[PDB]
A paper describes a structure:
The physiological role of the [name] [name] is quinone reductase, and this is likely to be the case for enzymes of this class also in other bacteria. Reductions mediated by [name] involve electron transfer from NADH to the various substrates via ping-pong bi-bi (double displacement) reaction resulting in the transfer of electrons from NADH to the enzyme bound flavin co-factor, which subsequently passes them on to the enzyme substrate. We discovered the soluble [name] class of enzymes in search for such a mechanism. This class of enzymes is widely distributed in bacteria, and can greatly mitigate redox cycling not only by a one-step reduction of chromate to Cr(III) but also by preempting its reduction by cellular one-electron reducers. Structurally, [name] belongs to the FMN reductase family of flavodoxin superfamily.
In order to gain mechanistic insights into this important enzyme, which could afford rational means for its improvement, we report here the crystal structure of the [name] [name] enzyme at 2.2 Å resolution. FMN, representing the enzyme active site, is located in a shallow cavity surrounded by loops 1, 3 and 4 at the C-terminus of the β-sheet. FMN is anchored by several hydrogen bonds to a typical strand-loop-helix nucleotide-binding motif GSLRKGSFN (residues 12 to 20) located on loop 1 of the protein. The asymmetric unit is composed of two molecules forming a homo-dimer with a buried surface of 4670 Å2 (about 32%) for a total surface area of 14630 Å2. In the dimer, the two FMN prosthetic groups locate at opposite sides of the interface with loop 2 from one monomer covering the prosthetic group of the other monomer. A potential metal binding site is observed in the dimer interface, involving residues Asn50 and Asp52 (loop 2) from one monomer and the carbonyl oxygen of Leu14 (loop 3) of the other. A calcium ion has been modeled at this site because the crystallization buffer contains calcium. However, size-exclusion chromatography at various protein concentrations, including those used for measuring the enzyme activity, showed that the active enzyme is indeed a tetramer. Within the tetramer, the dimers interact by a pair of two hydrogen bond networks, each involving Tyr128 and Glu146 of one dimer and Arg125 and Tyr85 of the other with the latter extending to one of the redox FMN cofactors, as shown in Fig. 3. We also show that a hydrogen bond network involving four amino acids at the dimer-dimer interface and reaching towards the flavin mononucleotide (FMN) cofactor plays a central role in chromate reductase activity of [name].
Residue numbers in the entry:
A (entry chain B), D (entry chain B): 4 to 185
B (entry chain A), C (entry chain A): 4 to 184
Write the structure that this text describes.
Amino acid sequence: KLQVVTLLGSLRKGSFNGMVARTLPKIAPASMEVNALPSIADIPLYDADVQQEEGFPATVEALAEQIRQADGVVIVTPEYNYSVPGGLKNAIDWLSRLPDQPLAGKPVLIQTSSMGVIGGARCQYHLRQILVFLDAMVMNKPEFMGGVIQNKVDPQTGEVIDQGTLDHLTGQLTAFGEFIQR
Amino acid sequence: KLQVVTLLGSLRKGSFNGMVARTLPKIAPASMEVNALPSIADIPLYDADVQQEEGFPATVEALAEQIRQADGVVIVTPEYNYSVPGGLKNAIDWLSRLPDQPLAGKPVLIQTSSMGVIGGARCQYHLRQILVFLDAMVMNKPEFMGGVIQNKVDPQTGEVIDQGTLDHLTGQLTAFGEFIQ
Amino acid sequence: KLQVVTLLGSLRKGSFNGMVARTLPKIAPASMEVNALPSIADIPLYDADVQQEEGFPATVEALAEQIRQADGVVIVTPEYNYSVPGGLKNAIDWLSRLPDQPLAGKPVLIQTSSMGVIGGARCQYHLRQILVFLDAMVMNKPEFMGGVIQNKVDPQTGEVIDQGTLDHLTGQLTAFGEFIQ
Amino acid sequence: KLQVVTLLGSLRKGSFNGMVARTLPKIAPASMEVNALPSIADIPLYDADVQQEEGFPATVEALAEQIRQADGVVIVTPEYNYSVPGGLKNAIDWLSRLPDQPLAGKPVLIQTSSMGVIGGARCQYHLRQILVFLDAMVMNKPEFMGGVIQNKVDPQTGEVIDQGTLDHLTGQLTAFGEFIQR
Ligand SMILES: Cc1cc2nc3c(=O)[nH]c(=O)nc-3n(C[C@H](O)[C@H](O)[C@H](O)COP(=O)(O)O)c2cc1C
Ligand SMILES: Cc1cc2nc3c(=O)[nH]c(=O)nc-3n(C[C@H](O)[C@H](O)[C@H](O)COP(=O)(O)O)c2cc1C
Ligand SMILES: Cc1cc2nc3c(=O)[nH]c(=O)nc-3n(C[C@H](O)[C@H](O)[C@H](O)COP(=O)(O)O)c2cc1C
Ligand SMILES: Cc1cc2nc3c(=O)[nH]c(=O)nc-3n(C[C@H](O)[C@H](O)[C@H](O)COP(=O)(O)O)c2cc1C
Ligand SMILES: [Ca+2]
Ligand SMILES: [Ca+2]
């Protein structure tokens, strides 16, 4: 069984991308198991001085060890001002500074959702440029951009229910599972 | 006289970009007064729940008001992992949610420095894409990419000394001053 | 009254973006006259040897002069392979080499359409990066990405009909008109 | 012996990138053979109407068949206005429309050179975004950006002679050769 984890790019309780991430474990192919990674909320802003005098934040090393243990990582994130959320980017800046950089050679799947029609596509291309330097193995197609995400979820359960969205989500995961087999 | 402020993208005290930023005051045109904005170090990670429950952070409000009063903003920052540093971007995310969005229509000048020959060039274009949604007035030329800034600064004073760099910057500021109108 | 011209990025006769372009004349503000520039179809591939030996192509010179006379340029184009179409970009490469570079300081408005929901959004930001080196004055908002334009046009007239799209465009032009100053 | 070919992004006789491309065959690892692809100069501007009424240009199909035959492709190109040269992009637009798109799943190496200090880096990131849609297998590091390329070549021979540039060029090719073994 492949072990895939999710890195969440939004910090709000009712996050839509948060709902997409929690739905993935329930629709993953039988040969895949998905779990959520710890939240990035308590990670402090990156400062070279702290890295030297304090060492690495426990939260950063905990997140890093779980990524190394996993066979694949799915980054589920919204788009902020046509790009990557500062919080998520900051968690990536810390990670990129670690011994045995956790994402190098690591299979990565990208997922974004927005209330807008474009569904976070802009965020995705900047993210790939970032992951290139970190040497992650990013899967090309299929891509997933959840537009008008609010009309495809269930507020109570906090999950995706729109049939169309569920099939594409399941399709991509399957492709990612086959991708990981490398 | 024009009032210009600097937004710093690095937090370490030995910051080379910080050196660039603190050098701008004495090489700017005689019609410009360059001062620094507060550090983005205390600005907490963006969370809509916080915006709703607590309102906007006081540090964010302070940063914003200084931006509103300025005639222009010079963003001085390094490039982290082929893009914009997490901290700087997070501060921008916060500012972008403000009712009277501070950077809307605000003239902006970009400058980056790095220990490598590319001088933070990649970071600049991602930052330009981001600035479109904030609706800022970003100047085109001349651009400034400080390649290997470590060889052209003076540690004792923490300012730039390489005459070539100094004239480049001065030319850019002079150009930014004309841009304001 | 302002003179605005359109640079078309697609060459096929059934071009949806072409439909957008030819619709702009009757939805523009009363202070703007929108006309089309010549097609980029005859512009040959850029080659410095040709620039040196033959000089600039007459078609390139013609395109340039019309750009110089206009108060603004609206670039209407599709998105090919997640970026700017080869032909359009090649025409820009030619213009960029001209002594009195036509687009320098020229206000530019970008609009794209596609048969998909993204509406050529990716192409727009690459094009914005390119326009920095040409030193153009590119407007920020509102932006226009015509998603699935095929469902909102009228083949018999070859113009846009979807009222929502029409008002969006009109609003953009009105905004571009104010931008010129 | 792996068969690698070069796609040239500049059309001028004295092209510096042209010199870099011609030097590659002479410094490739013993397990690799490099050849130049036909020139893109005579390829007409892409027009959907021509594709339908005329079919594909012979030059486009000749270039496409040679790419399919090769084990790897090195794109050597300059940077025009912070991006990909229109001519090269146009040759890619035609290619992307072919049956059995020639670059899908094809190993690709990127090389750029400029008279400027940045050496065509801007062109490279836009190109990768393009190759992602075409589903090419693009190698991450090492990257090659030849800055101030004019002071590293020999006008007469039309080749690179700067020792430093030659070593990196040889290093990348070796990495690409090992990369191709996939
Ligand atoms: C700082 C900030 C910037 C935003 N900018 C964008 C943007 O550039 N593109 C976009 O599609 N949506 C943007 N939005 C709207 C988000 O898509 C929307 O708030 C979304 O539902 C947030 O993701 P979440 O629900 O998982 O918290 C922005 C939201 C925030 C908080
Ligand atoms: C998290 C992190 C990521 C880095 N990644 C890059 C990069 O992608 N490109 C680059 O040119 N330099 C990179 N560097 C090197 C910086 O350019 C160099 O540390 C610089 O001197 C930092 O800016 P400062 O001196 O103002 O603190 C990185 C540094 C850090 C801390
Ligand atoms: C070479 C080529 C590449 C294409 N690639 C893309 C793409 O990357 N993104 C997209 O949204 N549409 C793409 N399409 C579909 C176009 O959006 C669609 O054909 C469009 O209607 C063309 O613009 P036009 O109608 O003005 O000729 C491509 C079309 C062609 C001819
Ligand atoms: C249309 C055009 C646009 C140019 N724009 C850029 C640019 O954006 N970045 C850059 O580094 N060099 C630029 N240059 C300078 C080239 O790097 C230089 O002419 C180079 O030596 C061309 O590649 P080649 O020698 O193989 O023909 C431009 C050249 C041309 C012909
Ligand atoms: Ca929260
Ligand atoms: Ca030639």
